[PDB]
Amino acid sequence: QCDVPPNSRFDCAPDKAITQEQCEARGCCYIPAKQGQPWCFFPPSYPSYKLENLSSSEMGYTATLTRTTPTFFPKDILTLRLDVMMETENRLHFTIKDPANRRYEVPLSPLYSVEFSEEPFGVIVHRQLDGRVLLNTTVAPLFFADQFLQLSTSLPSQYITGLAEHLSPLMLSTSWTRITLWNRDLAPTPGANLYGSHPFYLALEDGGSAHGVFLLNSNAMDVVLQPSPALSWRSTGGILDVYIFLGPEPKSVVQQYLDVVGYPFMPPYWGLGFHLCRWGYSSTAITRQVVENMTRAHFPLDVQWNDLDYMDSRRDFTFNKDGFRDFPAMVQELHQGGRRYMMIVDPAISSSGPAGSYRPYDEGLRRGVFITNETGQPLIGKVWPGSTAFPDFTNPTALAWWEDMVAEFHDQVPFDGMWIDMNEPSNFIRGSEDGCPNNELENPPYVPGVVGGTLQAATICASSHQFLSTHYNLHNLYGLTEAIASHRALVKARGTRPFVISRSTFAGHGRYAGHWTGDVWSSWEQLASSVPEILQFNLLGVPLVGADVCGFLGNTSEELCVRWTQLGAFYPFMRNHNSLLSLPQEPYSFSEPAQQAMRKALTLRYALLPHLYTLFHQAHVAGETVARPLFLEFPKDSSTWTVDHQLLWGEALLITPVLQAGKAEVTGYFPLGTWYDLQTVPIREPAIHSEGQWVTLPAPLDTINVHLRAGYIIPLQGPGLTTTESRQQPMALAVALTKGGEARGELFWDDGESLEVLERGAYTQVIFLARNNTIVNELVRVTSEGAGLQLQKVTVLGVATAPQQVLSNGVPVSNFTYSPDTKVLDICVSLLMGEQFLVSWC
Ligand SMILES: *[C@@H]1O[C@H](CO)[C@@H](O[C@@H]2O[C@H](CO)[C@@H](O[C@@H]3O[C@H](CO)[C@@H](O)[C@H](O)[C@@H]3O)[C@H](O)[C@H]2NC(C)=O)[C@H](O)[C@H]1NC(C)=O
Ligand SMILES: *[C@@H]1O[C@H](CO)[C@@H](O[C@@H]2O[C@H](CO)[C@@H](O[C@@H]3O[C@H](CO)[C@@H](O)[C@H](O)[C@@H]3O)[C@H](O)[C@H]2NC(C)=O)[C@H](O)[C@H]1NC(C)=O
Ligand SMILES: *[C@@H]1O[C@H](CO[C@@H]2O[C@@H](C)[C@@H](O)[C@@H](O)[C@@H]2O)[C@@H](O[C@@H]2O[C@H](CO)[C@@H](O)[C@H](O)[C@H]2NC(C)=O)[C@H](O)[C@H]1NC(C)=O
Ligand SMILES: *[C@@H]1O[C@H](CO)[C@@H](O[C@@H]2O[C@H](CO)[C@@H](O)[C@H](O)[C@H]2NC(C)=O)[C@H](O)[C@H]1NC(C)=O
Ligand SMILES: *[C@@H]1O[C@H](CO[C@@H]2O[C@@H](C)[C@@H](O)[C@@H](O)[C@@H]2O)[C@@H](O)[C@H](O)[C@H]1NC(C)=O
Ligand SMILES: OC[C@@]1(CCc2ccccc2)NC[C@H](O)[C@@H](O)[C@@H]1O
Ligand SMILES: [Cl-]
Ligand SMILES: [Cl-]
Ligand SMILES: [Cl-]
Ligand SMILES: [Cl-]
Ligand SMILES: [Cl-]
């Protein structure tokens, strides 16, 4: 019975160090490892639940689950209800609940077949097409106690991604890895629970099919991977609410997941521009000098930010009357030059001022908006202003108070978005100024592998009261609930698309806000680690994501700042942010050659903004990723599965960054096909003809490698120091022909910031097609927004022979150049995106 292969052993002492005698007393097997692998593990006969009275309804399947022998955890729930819902051809949904008591729940032919094991209970999910076993929860016992749920499954391969937020390769290690989901303020470092929690994984299958699993549970949890391969969800509360997404393509799995949690929000066009911030712009005069210095050196800047500097004594919804006396005028002036303005907002509200002196606290107290403690008073912690209370964003009155504080502050200073920090929520002391009570929420029977070994570390008491539940159940939603409240507040205050950037996140955050990866070191290792983390957030439906460009903590170097700007110009959210005690790292603060390299990176990003905005439209309407790993686009090429130091924008733009000091070249993977060097497009081989292989590319310090996939057309737009300027420029097409002379692309265009654009039809959508030495547009929708768009240049890659003639609408063109070396045809035209054209050559 104890003859269990080592990799298939499931831990029977997850709760503590255990002796052979205690292990065998639990009904478990004790076999020491010969060198991690559990010594105490479940025999196949270990008591689980038994399935009884399975019945079929129009809803799907229902059953009773009964445990007869108690586990070693307190408060087993001996009778459960199983509900299995076949919701779509791609989505299976099952829940395990207590039929006698409402437990906390998070507020939010088919491709599969399902069968059940009776004793021990398990759910088995097959892919119907090839019979692969995707889920099998029979592999280990089901635990369902008041503060301990455990559900296990086999995995179909060693390849699994998800379970943010952690600093790790994109593909998670199955070598006895414990992944802890408990939102925590900590500088990103491996093996730690960071700012957000996304209980979703995508598992690859031999052949390139994939499935996804979402556990809709917001409690502190560990997810344990083992090399059999297998996975165990271990949660401290709530219910088992499981979604399986059948794909079969990894891009379809992500879309199906986003059909449950929400499609990404559509950012304003200006949010895709360059953002510049630091802690230490300590007056309006210094802040204005940043914009002046960027402009003087020809660096694009859409959005100027301030950190805590603007505040009066580090209090939200205030501004100091020293350095920031003319704060309103500074922001009106940024607007007059065509820029936007963002500033930090903390959740915690100063509680120590004299009564009637600080409206956010005084009004919060009147309306009962704050998280309360055991004696029904506001829980007091310590953050920047000193003593603070913590708003409860699950309370409908707190949402109304937050909308009012934001609208009142906006009437003083017309900010364009909110940077919401410290929303784990982060606490400089443990729990509260008054400590925490001694109860089973503060001291639970199973504590996941959190930094500091307590749920209270760097946050508030777990037994504190919110409107919907205790903090114990809601902690991992705190940031998400503040992002919702802030998205609503900004819609109401400004009447245009909101722009919220949040530290802490939970599954479905991307429906409301973006994310930055937090307090990353200015190091080559954190530069490199940023690529998998940005890709991971795109797979989780938070495509508006980036890292602080050049790093946050410590001092950047010139070389690191060049490489980081080059890669960071391909973050969907691009901000350079810097800590208080650091050397300056604005683009204008470096040597002339470093400035030229950083200016080229920013110029290329601005030229691509119509394309990046179109990719955001596809995320918003169809659950697509913006930045995506090669394995999402080429899943049938197993060589792509471990690549996470390259990225795609959409289907067609491959970015191969240098991520190490002292390198003048880089080796990247090129899937089968032709890849054109984007340096051959007016803004080293001209084309890589790949069989699916690794290629060494020249990569001097002034260069980042970017390749355009054959078969794709990219819209570009002329230059500007802001999107206010760039959006008025003529456009261009880059047309990457296949060997057979074909290519396709698209452009989505609207006014860049209105609400309900898609509902109201206030947009333009154009498809571009190349075939047989002709390029045409196909007008899906044309409205006022895009009818004035001017096309001035058409650059055609892979043109084998110099044309005799180039026609635009049947008339010879005024000017074109053909390069026989690069096989580029560059065509000057005067056409309109929104009117049918036909360009031809021979
Ligand atoms: C889902 O996972 C469960 C548990 O790992 C799998 O059930 C187990 O299947 C093994 C191998 O077939 C069974 O062992 C076999 O049992 C027969 C009858 O005693 C014996 O003659 C063979 O020599 C062999 O050892 C094992 O009994 C069974 N375990 C349980 C708990 O039922 C199951 O196969 C998986 N389902 C799928 C579709 O993969
Ligand atoms: C729930 O939160 C409230 C705050 O909203 C806690 O109130 C705090 O209670 C402690 C005593 O338990 C007060 O300390 C006292 O302060 C005075 C000076 O002002 C001093 O003379 C006393 O020796 C004592 O230190 C503390 O002031 C008070 N905080 C505030 C902001 O009034 C309450 O204790 C919390 N309840 C639990 C069970 O944790
Ligand atoms: C499994 O179900 C049986 C039968 O329950 C009945 O049929 C169902 C479809 C539904 O209409 C129920 O409300 C019915 O009671 C349960 O066995 C019965 O248990 C009750 C209560 O102890 C008893 O009065 C009956 O004599 C039993 N009937 C038979 C035919 O055995 C059984 O308890 C259920 N199992 C579990 C573990 O819940
Ligand atoms: C904007 O750039 C100006 C000009 O480089 C900076 O001011 C200079 O900074 C040096 C130190 O590098 C001072 O010692 C000089 O007195 C300044 N020169 C001039 C012409 O004023 C300024 O610090 C920059 N501001 C910011 C916020 O980056
Ligand atoms: C970051 O740099 C700060 C200032 O460093 C000084 O100036 C730079 C240009 C170098 O010449 C350096 O050797 C000088 O000391 C430091 O005060 C600060 O501690 C640095 N931070 C870290 C964490 O190393
Ligand atoms: O608002 C201040 C700030 C940095 C605090 C800090 C503490 C210790 C050391 C360094 C910085 N809060 C944390 C944010 O993630 C960061 O972007 C922001 O600038
Ligand atoms: Cl509850
Ligand atoms: Cl939605
Ligand atoms: Cl309620
Ligand atoms: Cl090709
Ligand atoms: Cl023309």
- State whether the beta carbon of 124 lies less than 6 angstroms from ligand 1: yes
The angstrom resolution of this structure is 1.8
User: CA angle, corner 79, sides to 73 and 85, nearest 5?
Assistant: 110
Known binding-site positions for substrate: 307, 503, 519, 577
According to DSSP, residue 25 is labeled: H
Rounded to whole angstroms, how far apart are CA atoms 49 and 68? 8
Closest CA to 11 of 29, 20, 154, 24: 29
- State whether the beta carbon of 547 lies less than 6 angstroms from ligand 6: no
**How far out from the chain centre does Cα 627 lie?**
10
Backbone angles phi, psi at 334, to 5 degrees: -60, -45
Residue with tokens 């229902």, as numbered in its chain = 62
Rounded to whole angstroms, how far apart are CA atoms 418 and 624? 25
How do beta strands 838-841 and 806-808 pair?
antiparallel
Domains of the chain: 1-46 (4.10.110.10), 51-261 (2.60.40.1760), 346-515 (3.20.20.80), 627-708 (2.60.40.1180), 730-841 (2.60.40.1180)
Q: Please, are residues 673 and 710 in contact by the beta-carbon 8 Å criterion?
A: yes
Considering Cα of 468, then 472, then 474, then 475, what sign does the dihedral take?
Answer: positive
- State whether the beta carbon of 555 lies less than 6 angstroms from ligand 5: yes
What's at 746, amino acid-wise? Answer: E
Rounded to whole angstroms, how far apart are CA atoms 495 and 269? 16
For the chain, the residue count is 842
Burial of residue 130 (number of CB atoms within 10 Å: 0-12, 13-18, 19+): exposed
**How far out from the chain centre does Cα 372 lie?**
31
* Interval between CA 739 and ligand 10 midpoint (Å): 5
**How far out from the chain centre does Cα 354 lie?**
41
The DSSP bridge partners found for residue 431 are 460
CA distances, 469 to each of 25, 288, 388, 393, 636 (Å)? 37, 45, 21, 12, 45
- State whether the beta carbon of 554 lies less than 6 angstroms from ligand 5: yes
* Residue 76: other Cβ atoms inside 10 A: 17
3-class secondary-structure state, position 295? helix
Known binding-site positions: 307, 503, 519, 577
CA distances, 724 to each of 299, 318, 337, 715 (Å)? 14, 29, 9, 18
Ligand closest to 814 (CA) is 11
Residue with tokens 């000057």, as numbered in its chain = 828
Residue with tokens 């599954």, as numbered in its chain = 507
Ligand closest to 687 (CA) is 10
Which residues touch 27 (CB under 8 Å, ≥6 apart)?
Answer: 43, 46, 47, 69
According to DSSP, residue 457 is labeled: T
Which residues touch 59 (CB under 8 Å, ≥6 apart)?
Answer: 83, 85
Residue with tokens 């090669």, as numbered in its chain = 630
- State whether the beta carbon of 381 lies less than 6 angstroms from ligand 2: no
- State whether the beta carbon of 428 lies less than 6 angstroms from ligand 6: no
Query: Which residues are near ligand 3 (CB < 6 Å)?
Result: 52-53, 64, 66
In the sheet that holds 774-781, the strands lie side by side as: 811-812, 806-808, 838-841, 774-781, 764-771, 743-749, 712-717, 731-736, 790-797, 824-832, 815-819
Using CA positions, which residue lies closest to atom 7 of ligand 6? Answer: 579
Q: Please, are residues 520 and 433 in contact by the beta-carbon 8 Å criterion?
A: no
Ligand closest to 829 (CA) is 11
Nearest ligand 5 atom to alpha carbon 553: 23
- Reply yes or no: is the peptide bond before residue 391 cis, omega within 30 of 0: no
User: CA angle, corner 43, sides to 176 and 214, nearest 5?
Assistant: 50
Nearest ligand 3 atom to alpha carbon 53: 1
Q: Please, are residues 270 and 612 in contact by the beta-carbon 8 Å criterion?
A: no
Listing DSSP states for 744-807 in one string gives: EEEEEE--SS-SSHHHHT--EEEEEEEETTEEEEEEEE--HHHHTPEEEEEEEE---S--S-EE
* Interval between CA 286 and ligand 4 midpoint (Å): 10
**Residues catalogued as catalytic:** 421, 424
Ligand closest to 100 (CA) is 3
Rounded to whole angstroms, how far apart are CA atoms 638 and 628? 16
- Reply yes or no: is the peptide bond before residue 229 cis, omega within 30 of 0: yes
**If residue 829 lies in a helix (H) or strand (E), which one and from where to where?**
strand 824-832
Rounded to whole angstroms, how far apart are CA atoms 293 and 290? 5
**If residue 545 lies in a helix (H) or strand (E), which one and from where to where?**
strand 545-546
- PDB experimental method: X-ray
User: CA angle, corner 482, sides to 419 and 579, nearest 5?
Assistant: 30
Which residues touch 434 (CB under 8 Å, ≥6 apart)?
Answer: 373, 380
* Interval between CA 398 and ligand 2 midpoint (Å): 23
Q: Please, are residues 250 and 635 in contact by the beta-carbon 8 Å criterion?
A: yes
Backbone angles phi, psi at 337, to 5 degrees: -90, 0
Rounded to whole angstroms, how far apart are CA atoms 531 and 563? 13
The two structure tokens encoding residue 374:
């055991």
Using CA positions, which residue lies closest to atom 2 of ligand 3? Answer: 53
Q: Please, are residues 75 and 145 in contact by the beta-carbon 8 Å criterion?
A: yes
Closest CA to 425 of 396, 453, 466, 377: 466
* Interval between CA 598 and ligand 5 midpoint (Å): 23
Rounded to whole angstroms, how far apart are CA atoms 637 and 646? 15
What's at 124, amino acid-wise? Answer: I
* Interval between CA 543 and ligand 8 midpoint (Å): 14
* Interval between CA 701 and ligand 10 midpoint (Å): 30
- State whether the beta carbon of 374 lies less than 6 angstroms from ligand 2: yes
What's at 524, amino acid-wise? Answer: W
* Interval between CA 116 and ligand 1 midpoint (Å): 13
Rounded to whole angstroms, how far apart are CA atoms 798 and 680? 11
Residues with CB under 5 A from ligand 7 (ion): 104, 469
Closest CA to 335 of 237, 414, 428, 254: 414
Using CA positions, which residue lies closest to atom 14 of ligand 1? Answer: 44
- State whether the beta carbon of 289 lies less than 6 angstroms from ligand 4: yes
Q: Please, are residues 83 and 76 in contact by the beta-carbon 8 Å criterion?
A: no
User: CA angle, corner 446, sides to 445 and 447, nearest 5?
Assistant: 120
- State whether the beta carbon of 388 lies less than 6 angstroms from ligand 2: no
Using CA positions, which residue lies closest to atom 14 of ligand 5? Answer: 583
User: CA angle, corner 691, sides to 690 and 697, nearest 5?
Assistant: 35
Question: Using N-to-C axis directions, what is the helix angle for 478-494 and 396-412, rounded to 10°?
Answer: 50
What's at 267, amino acid-wise? Answer: P
* Residue 259: other Cβ atoms inside 10 A: 16
- Reply yes or no: is the peptide bond before residue 425 cis, omega within 30 of 0: yes
The b-or-e profile of 798-832 (16+ CB within 10 A means b, else e) is bbeeebeebbbeeeebeebebeeebbbbbbebebb
The b-or-e profile of 321-342 (16+ CB within 10 A means b, else e) is eebbebbeebbeebeeebbbbb
Listing DSSP states for 76-141 in one string gives: B--EEEEEEEE-SSSEEEEEEE-TTSPPP------SEEEEEEETTEEEEEEETTT--EEEEGGGS-
Using CA positions, which residue lies closest to atom 9 of ligand 2? Answer: 434
Residue with tokens 């604005």, as numbered in its chain = 586
What's at 624, amino acid-wise? Answer: E
Mutate to test the pocket of ligand 6, among 311, 383, 421 (most ligand atoms within 8 A of CB): 421
Q: What is the dihedral of CA 696, 700, 702, 708, to 10 degrees?
A: -10
CA distances, 807 to each of 383, 804, 811, 836, 841 (Å)? 66, 10, 5, 14, 6
Percentage helix, strand, coil, to 5, in the chain? Answer: 25, 30, 45
Using CA positions, which residue lies closest to atom 9 of ligand 4? Answer: 589
Ligand closest to 467 (CA) is 9
Within 13 Å, how many C-alpha atoms sit on residue 729's CB side? 21
Which residues touch 377 (CB under 8 Å, ≥6 apart)?
Answer: none
Q: How far apart are the first and last CA of the chain?
A: 77
Residue with tokens 């078969």, as numbered in its chain = 711
CA distances, 11 to each of 7, 38, 137, 232, 240 (Å)? 11, 5, 15, 10, 20
Using CA positions, which residue lies closest to atom 9 of ligand 3? Answer: 53
Burial of residue 56 (number of CB atoms within 10 Å: 0-12, 13-18, 19+): exposed
- State whether the beta carbon of 661 lies less than 6 angstroms from ligand 1: no
Question: Using N-to-C axis directions, what is the helix angle for 359-367 and 396-412, rounded to 10°?
Answer: 160
Q: After which residues is the chain broken (C to N over 2.5 A)?
A: 35, 108, 683
How do beta strands 514-516 and 545-546 pair?
parallel
* Interval between CA 450 and ligand 6 midpoint (Å): 21
CA distances, 323 to each of 377, 579, 586, 794 (Å)? 36, 19, 21, 49
Rounded to whole angstroms, how far apart are CA atoms 17 and 21? 12
Mutate to test the pocket of ligand 3, among 49, 51, 53, 81 (most ligand atoms within 8 A of CB): 53
Closest CA to 185 of 15, 406, 346: 346
- State whether the beta carbon of 114 lies less than 6 angstroms from ligand 1: no
3-class secondary-structure state, position 826? strand
Listing DSSP states for 572-634 in one string gives: SSEEE---TTSPP-SGGGS-HHHHHHHHHHHHHHHHHHHHHHHHHHHHHHH---SEE-HHHH-
Q: Please, are residues 46 and 114 in contact by the beta-carbon 8 Å criterion?
A: no
3-class secondary-structure state, position 491? helix
3-class secondary-structure state, position 541? coil
